[PDB]
Structures are given as structure tokens and as C-alpha cells.
Amino acid sequence: LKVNQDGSRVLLRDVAKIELGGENYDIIAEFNGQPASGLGIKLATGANALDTAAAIRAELAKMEPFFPSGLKIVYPYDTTPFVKISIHEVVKTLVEAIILVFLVMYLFLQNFRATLIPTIAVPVVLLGTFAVLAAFGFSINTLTMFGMVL
Amino acid sequence: DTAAAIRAELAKMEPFFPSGLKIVYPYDTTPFVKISIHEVVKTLVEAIIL
Amino acid sequence: GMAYLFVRLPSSFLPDEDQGVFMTMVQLPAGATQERTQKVLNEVTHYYLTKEKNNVESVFAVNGAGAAGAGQNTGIAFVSLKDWADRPGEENKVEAITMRATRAFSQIKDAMVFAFNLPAIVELGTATGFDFELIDQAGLGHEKLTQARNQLLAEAAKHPDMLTSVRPNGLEDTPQFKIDIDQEKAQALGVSINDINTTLGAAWGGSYVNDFIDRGRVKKVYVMSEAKYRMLPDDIGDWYVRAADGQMVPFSAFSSSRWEYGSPRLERYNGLPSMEILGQAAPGKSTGEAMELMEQLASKLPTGVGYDWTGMSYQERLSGNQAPSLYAISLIVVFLCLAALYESWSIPFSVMLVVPLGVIGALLAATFRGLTNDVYFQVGLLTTIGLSAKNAILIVEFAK
Amino acid sequence: GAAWGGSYVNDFIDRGRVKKVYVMSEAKYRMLPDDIGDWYVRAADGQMVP
Amino acid sequence: AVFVPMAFFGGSTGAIYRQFSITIVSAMALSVLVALILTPALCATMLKPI
Amino acid sequence: DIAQVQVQNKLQLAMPLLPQEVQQQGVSVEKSSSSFLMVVGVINTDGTMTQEDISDYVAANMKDAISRTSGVGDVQLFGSQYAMRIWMNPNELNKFQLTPVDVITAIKAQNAQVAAGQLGGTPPVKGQQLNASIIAQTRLTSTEEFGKIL
Amino acid sequence: GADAKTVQDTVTQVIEQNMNGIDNLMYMSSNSDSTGTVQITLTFESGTDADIAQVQVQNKLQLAMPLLPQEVQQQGVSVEKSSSSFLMVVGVINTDGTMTQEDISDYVAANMKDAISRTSGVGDVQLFGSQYAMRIWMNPNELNKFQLTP
């Protein structure tokens, strides 16, 4: 920094703390009040579903083993398994409608053939619909499946 | 479209204008496109009753 | 009774769910140190952790952001809950939980704490009333827009009949610290104004200088006074700049200081100085006439103040605008195809009359469930009338 | 260049709107080719050359 | 005819009305085609004499 | 649209090879007919304003907004927004042994905005209560102000 | 280091002026913080082209970038197109205590954020903490002792 008429040396550490610090010191997070960093993750207009959410676990499976001693993830936030028990409990309902109607059929068309007729007639007419949905751009969201339920 | 939009942004401006500030419209390839198409409806009509 | 069941019945857009997670908002006064905010985050966590173990799984809390902005007085909580099968009951669903939480937090003095559910989906927060914006349509400044917005904030929270909770969304004219370099003393003492302003800015605000390398990755090099010299306004006096001769002047000489006032989240909308306004209609009223009332209360305001609706108030949404026009031309298309199938003009009316008999038990289900007319409902309604059509159509096509 | 052609220096603020600050000789010193002689630059010592 | 004019239209809202109109008129045509393709056929080969 | 930026990829493959003086003003990149669409004139009726005023009022209240509206590929103003005008005198500049440079520089000096941190910002010393911004040299707003520069 | 207004005039104002002839637009929301931040959001028709709408701005963002402070494009301007609602938040906690929070933040900021962010459809990653940075904390008593400024 400067030398003197003294012949004295003046160094940086002589007028400041040198230290590995942070660009900014205003963000302090904790997880159950243990300290803990993380990523808050956003979505780009026109994206792209449980796609991106799987991709996260891509990049990260790829990172988990070079992590230092005792460094472990947690997942405190997830609009994911919501979209996963959403759609699941729709398959459930489709199923239920099917056997309930199998038995309402049985109560009038009291034979296993006339009854199995509108049975087969149900998946076909569904299945197909999804093929038509792909064909116009609509994806198997919650709304699509509720379409398949109503 | 755009020609209506002009009168949008501007209807939105006309009342905070100072004392004695007033528009005029010295140029308009607009009501040309408006008596153009009008005098076509006219002709269609005419063909019909003729 | 159909029509009356149809207008006595309220109107949702889409039901909120229990999405497994939810949030909490923490806002202090200002300037409010970071540490205080942390005090209140410790509180809030201590709740979701002692008083809710049966349902809470993880509170992720962050001193440093908000859903308004960063600030030392901005705070937010990310709460996840134990599985649905594991909290059976209404007592243990989002509603009741974030309720008693908000109710419990309600307590804390000089800390605005509120906890909420995620409004349904993505940035579809286009529900919940309105979002009004004042617009500096002349040269007025920050003062006159402050006051004008106060005239509004005032005259509208004195109409609690179709309009309530009318507050500004922004942050608030916290005091500021003015430093004044009388330039002449600086030339006379022989000090570079560059040197002054440089040192002031770097000392108290930091400065990114150049980049260094840290284990094969490039990072920054910042430079900034120790925190023991920038907490107090007296510490300006401790700073020396080297005059042109060689002597070192303290700021004490060429500067003059004093306290003042001014916004910390200045707002603009579409060019001009704007301020944005929030709140709802009032428990018997819709967002529409609420908006009108705001447009009218605005009218009585000083020359040069304009107004505009953005956000949820730009658009305006669903049933009551032109959706029965859809039901209508759908019906016209139907009676058309029925005049095609019967080749009558009367005979389809034997299938038109079949409709009220369905809206009747729809509407009945609605009001008798606490429920309310929304998208889900209206597609249920469509499906209703279509199916009844099927029934009647088949009986009379049989009969003829 | 500044005298005879103007110069944009920095920006100022004019009723809550940012605008320019230009700098340029009065028009009484740039109409005639003789007016080049009226312009002085400060030499390294201190003396001013035309 | 009941479902189609709901795909119409406006806003952030009507998006959702598309998500059903289509998803259900689809099943319409599929069902009614099956109804003259698959149903009558399987209601011929599989019904037991009365 | 693609034809529109594809140029300006390249326009900034060279922008640092143009004068300081030229990207201080700034380069524009339009895509538009040369034929106008309409021309809207503004006239004051009492005489209360000259033409330069009118021009300014529009340039500062009307052009920005109109131009911000889609499909409007270039607005050409008939006049000019205001601008602080320092008309120098040479007789009097040399009288005090001054050139233009000194004016230019006294101006960069005295018309500016500086950024000067906070009081009790991050990181802070624990036990602090106060947290406010610091305000310093702030831009000029009047003719007189420019007058009294040192 | 900037105050609200300093930023607001110096940066915000000066981009806003230069935002036009950007298609299909509805409005322009403009925040200016006492933390020396600004933010400007442009909104387009539903169903509109995310990508063209995405650069069309930044044609213009660099029709002005040389009129911003040195200090501001030394840091650098960003231009996103993304929902404000997160998707998930992934937290990182060390388990033995072997690392503080600032370490954790750094390890991610230097090993995790770059990669996750590089994955398509991921329109903004907000880090909960801060990458490291060499910190020279100056002392004034000792700076003046040797006749030195910053």
C-alpha cells in the first residue's frame, strides 16, 4: 500500500480485515431454526410440467456424492406430490364409477355378457380421448382428468 | 386497430392538458378506409334491389 | 324458484385446496434492524414447532425477503405439513390451522404477522377483490401524490358498506440521512470531490472492485469499512480524505448533515409516478360496484391525479359478464339441431322445457352445502342440461 | 467541438422526468469563420492561446 | 352444442372452459362412433337368445 | 420479429467500437413502413404557449405513451423535448482564464447523483436498533441551480 | 449502496424512457428500492409468444445500457420471463454442525445453483444466502494513521 520515509512498509492487512465473506449479508435462512441455505425455484412462462420437477432431481442426483461431510438435503416445499395425489384420486374415481355401474348394470341386465358390454365400452371411449388430447395440445392435468370423470 | 389505439392513449390524456391546449388532425388515411368500405356495402345493397 | 335459487347463490371461481404447504408473512416498522425481525421469526417458529407438532413437518424460515420486498424488516415462513391421512379432521386442515395461527400471531406488538394458504394455483391470484392505482398525471412529485392518496385512503375507509381494508401496498416514508458537501470548502481545502464522494460511498455502502478466483471459480472482491464505523451518524466524523497538498481533512470540515424523509420503494405505473392501492368489496357486495365506488371517490381529488385499474381489476373474470351469452348461443345451437331432428319448431320445445328441472336440483345442492356457483359447478350445470336433453329427446323421439 | 457543435454532458431532472444538459456557445460566436479567432485554450503553463 | 360455446373464451378464466369443452365433446364423438362401430357389433355377437 | 433482432445481435458485435459520443446518445433499431399513418398536431388556442413549450409538453406527456402502444414502429416528433441549455460566452470564458472543458467538468461534478450506503446496514454490530439509508449529492432541477455552480 | 430516488432517476427512469415499440404489451410496473434495487415488469396478451416478447424488450434494454452508471452494468442487468409463484424450494442443511450457514450458501452457490439454473424452463433461481466474496473491511483510524483514504 505504501512505503515510508522511515523505510516502513504499509500492507493491506495493516489497515483492514481480510476475510472470505459474502457478497451480501441480508439473507439469513434456517430450517427448523437450524441454519440452512437453499434454492427458491421459479418457472418460465410456457413451461413444462412435473418435467422441470424431475429435472431438478436430475441435476441433483448428479451432485449428491461429492458433497462434503454431513451435507444433506431437505424438501420443505413441494407443489409436486399435490399434483400426484390429485391425479391418483381420479384414476380411483374412474375405477369406482366403473364397478359401481357394473353393479347397477347387474341389477337390471342380470347377465355377465350384457353387463360386460358397456364395461369394455368405457376404457375405449376414455383412452381414445387422451389420444385426441395430445392431438390438440391439452395435457393430462387435473382439469383434463375431471373432464374424464364428469 | 392502431388508429383507434391512438385515440385510446389520447382520450386518456385530454383532461390534464393545460389552458388552451387543443388537438387537430391534419392527416388521416383513416376515414378514407371508412368511406371506401362504406360505399361497398352501398353497392352490394344496390345490386340486391336492382 | 330456479331463478331465485340462481341469484341467492354466491359465486366462487375455483375452490382453494389444502396443497400440503402454506405460508406466513412478517413485516415490521422501518427502519427496524435485522435482529428484531429475527426475534419475531423465532417467535413464529416457536409456535409452529411447540403448538402444532401433530401437523407441522417443517418450517423453513427466511429473514431477508417478503412477498413485498427485501428489507431488514421483511420476514417469511415456509411451512410444510405432515401427511393428510396423518392429520384427519377439519381441525387439522389448512383453513383451521392458518386460522388459529393468524389468530394467535395477531398478538405480537409492532410486528405485522399474518399467515395464509396459497391461492389455488401459479400466479393465478386474479381473485380477492381489487388493486387500484393512482397516477401522477402532471409534475406533482412525491408529496402531492402521498397526500392525494391519503385523501383517498381516508374518504374510502369512511364508506365501510361496499369497500373495506383499504390500505396502500407499499412501504412507508421512513426517515433518511442527508449529507451536504458545501463545495467551496472542498476546493478551498484542496480536496477532490471525487475523493470525497468515493470514500463516502465505499465506506458506508461497499464497493465491488474486481474479481478473484476461489478454487477454480471466479468470485467478487468487495471493500468496505468494518461495521464499528458505520452504525452511528457521528461516525461520519471519523473519516479522513487526503487534501491536494498532503494534509488529511475529516468530513467534519466540508460537510453538513441533517435528517429528512422519503420513500424506500418508489413506485411507477406506465411511465409516470404511481402509487398502488389494495382491499376488497364489502361482505354483501361484489368487486364491480366496489370498483365503481373507487372510481367515484377518486373523481373528487386534486387537479393532476389520474387513476387506472391493473392486475385483477384489468381483466374482470367470469359469470355475470358474458357467460350466460355462451349458455345462450349454446342453447340457440341446440334448438337449431332439435329443429333439425324433429323438423318441427314446436316439438323441440318439448325438450326445451326439460331444462329447469335440472338447474333446480343443481342450485338446491349448492346453497344446501354452503357451496357456491363456480367453474366446476357450471360445467356440472352444462352436463346436467345436456343429459336431461338426452333423456327427453329419447322419450319424444320415441313417441313421434 | 463543444463550442461549435454542442455537447451532451449529463442528464438533469425536470418535474419528475429526466432530460438532457447541453453545452454550447451562444450563437453570437459561431456564425462567421472569423469567430474561430475569438476562442481561447489554456496552455500547460497557464497562459491562454487563441 | 352445449359444450362447444364454452371453449368461448375470454381472459385468464376461459382457458379453463377450453379444458373441459374439448375434453368432453371428444368423449362425445368417440362414444357415439363406438355406438355404431363397437357397441352394435358387440351387442350382436355377445347377447344371449331370448 | 426474428429478422428484427437478428440484426441487433450483430449491432452489439460492434457497439463498443463506436465512439463514446455515439452510444452516449444511443443507437436505435426499428422495423417499419416509411409512409406515416396519421399526423396529430397540437395547437394552443389563446397563445398562452409558444411552439417549443408545446413540443416539450408532448415530448414529456404524449410521445412516451403513444409510442408505448404495440404496432407503432416509430414516432417522429415535430419539435424537441426540453433540455437545460448552457450557452457559453468566449470573451468571458477567457476573461477568467477558462475553456469549455472546465464548464463540462464543473458540471459532471456538480450535477450528479451519488450512492452512499446506509446507517446500520448488513452486516451490523449486534445490539443495533437504527437502520436507515444515506442520501448525498442529488441531481439538479432548475436553471438557477445550474447558474450558481462554482 | 444506492437510495431509492438515486436509483429511480438514474436507472429506472432511464430504462423506462427507452421502453417502446415492444409488441402486444399491456403495461409496465416499476419498483425502486432503498436497497438500491429496481425492477420492471412488462405484461403481454395471454397466449402470446414468450420468447419474442422476451428479447424484444432487451433489444431496447441495450438502447440505453451505456446511459446507466458504470457501477450498474459492472454488476450487470438481468432479463427474466417467469411466474412469481415458486415451484419448489430445496433446502440444504449440514447435520454434524461441521459448516455454518454462510459456508452452506457458498457451497451451493458455487456447486449447485449454476447447474440447476442451467436446466431449461427454470426461469429464475433465487438463492437463500450468498456465494463467497473476498471482503476487505477497512479501518478509518488506521487508514488516516498512514495518510490514506479508500
Curated annotation (Swiss-Prot), chain A:
Induction: Positively regulated by MarA, Rob and SoxS transcriptional regulators (at protein level). It is found in: Cell inner membrane. Disruption phenotype: Loss of susceptibility to contact-dependent growth inhibition (CDI); inhibiting cells still contact the target. The chain crosses the membrane at residues 87-106, 116-135. Residues 107-115 are cytoplasmic. Residues 136-141 are periplasmic. Belongs to the resistance-nodulation-cell division (RND) (TC 2.A.6) family. Homotrimer, with large domains that extend into the periplasm, interacts with AcrA and TolC. AcrA may be required to stably link this protein and TolC. Interacts with AcrZ. Part of the AcrA-AcrB-AcrZ-TolC efflux pump. AcrA-AcrB-AcrZ-TolC is a drug efflux protein complex with broad substrate specificity that uses the proton motive force to export substrates. (Microbial infection) Involved in contact-dependent growth inhibition (CDI), acts downstream of BamA, the receptor for CDI. Its role in CDI is independent of the AcrA-AcrB-TolC efflux pump complex. This is Multidrug efflux pump subunit AcrB.
UniProtKB/Swiss-Prot annotation, chain D:
Induction: Positively regulated by MarA, Rob and SoxS transcriptional regulators (at protein level). It is found in: Cell inner membrane. Disruption phenotype: Loss of susceptibility to contact-dependent growth inhibition (CDI); inhibiting cells still contact the target. Belongs to the resistance-nodulation-cell division (RND) (TC 2.A.6) family. AcrA-AcrB-AcrZ-TolC is a drug efflux protein complex with broad substrate specificity that uses the proton motive force to export substrates. Homotrimer, with large domains that extend into the periplasm, interacts with AcrA and TolC. AcrA may be required to stably link this protein and TolC. Interacts with AcrZ. Part of the AcrA-AcrB-AcrZ-TolC efflux pump. This is Multidrug efflux pump subunit AcrB. The lineage of its organism: Bacteria, Pseudomonadati, Pseudomonadota, Gammaproteobacteria, Enterobacterales. The gene is acrB. The chain holds residues 751 to 800 of 1049 of the full protein.
